[PDB]
Amino acid sequence: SSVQTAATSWGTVPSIRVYTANNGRITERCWDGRGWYTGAFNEPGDNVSVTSWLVGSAIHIRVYASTGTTTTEWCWDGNGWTRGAYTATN
Ligand SMILES: Cc1c(C)c2c3c4c1OP(=O)(O)Oc1c(C)c(C)c5c(c1C4)Cc1c(c(c(C)c(C)c1OP(=O)(O)O5)OP(=O)(O)O2)C3
Ligand SMILES: Cc1c(C)c2c3c4c1OP(=O)(O)Oc1c(C)c(C)c5c(c1C4)Cc1c(c(c(C)c(C)c1OP(=O)(O)O5)OP(=O)(O)O2)C3
Ligand SMILES: OC[C@@]1(O)OC[C@@H](O)[C@@H](O)[C@@H]1O
Ligand SMILES: OC[C@@]1(O)OC[C@@H](O)[C@@H](O)[C@@H]1O
């Protein structure tokens, strides 16, 4: 009935990323100080969570995308989104 979001931020500008699961697809909206724009993330999922951390000034983002009982981790480390090693307890 309602879309599901996850958000993360870094720095003091700040940079913000908001991930929205709608219709089985997760997309990404970005804020870097001058208006919201669309980011490169696009993966299947009904539910989403996110966390991020800085190494110096480089951001690292991990998005956990779930469909059914399957969760896939997606990794941003500065040069494209790549599948992570995450698997669940099951
Ligand atoms: C795709 C999808 C998601 C992501 C859902 C739900 C449903 C869902 O299937 P959908 O095709 O929408 O079928 C439904 C329809 C047509 C109606 C009228 C429903 C529900 C669903 C079931 C139950 C439902 C759900 C909710 C929430 C917050 C409410 C209020 C809520 O009651 P309400 O809106 O009165 O009743 O959780 P949420 O939307 O996050 O999860 C559960
Ligand atoms: C009107 C306007 C233009 C046409 C600019 C720039 C700025 C600008 O002023 P404004 O946007 O008000 O203030 C800024 C704000 C609020 C932020 C957060 C800025 C920048 C500016 C400065 C710096 C900046 C500029 C860039 C580019 C490509 C980047 C990535 C870029 O770093 P960004 O992460 O955005 O940081 O060049 P651009 O051709 O856009 O030139 C330079
Ligand atoms: O500048 C936008 C961008 O490169 O920021 C890092 C990640 O959020 C990417 O998905 C996104 O496209
Ligand atoms: O560099 C990617 C990676 O090693 O980063 C740390 C964890 O997110 C791992 O699952 C992931 O594969």
Numbering used by the authors: 1 to 90
Authors' account:
Here, we report protein recognition and assembly by a phosphate-containing macrocycle (pctx). The macrocycle of interest is the recently reported phosphate derivative of C 3-symmetric cyclotrixylohydroquinoylene, dubbed pctx and produced in 3 reaction steps. , Compared with the bowl-shaped, C 4-symmetric sulfonato-calix­ ­arene (sclx 4 , a known protein receptor), the saucer-shaped pctx is smaller, shallower, less polar and less anionic.
The arginine-enriched RSL-R6, with all lysine residues replaced by arginine (Lys25Arg, Lys34Arg, and Lys83Arg), cocrystallized with pctx in space group H3. Remarkably, RSL-R6 cocrystallized with pctx in the H3 space group, similar to RSL. The consequent rearrangement of the proteins relative to the pctx cluster results in a ∼20% elongated c axis, and minor contractions of the a and b axes. Thus, a single residue change, Lys34Arg, leads to expansion of the unit cell in one dimension. Besides demonstrating the possibility of crystal engineering, the RSL-R6–pctx cocrystal structure provides high-resolution detail of arginine complexation by pctx. The guanidinium group is perched 0.8 Å above the plane of the three −P–O– acceptors, with each N atom positioned 2.6 Å from the nearest phosphate oxygen, forming a chelate-type complex. In addition to clamping the guanidinium group, the pctx receptor engages the alkyl portion of the side chain between two upper rim methyls.
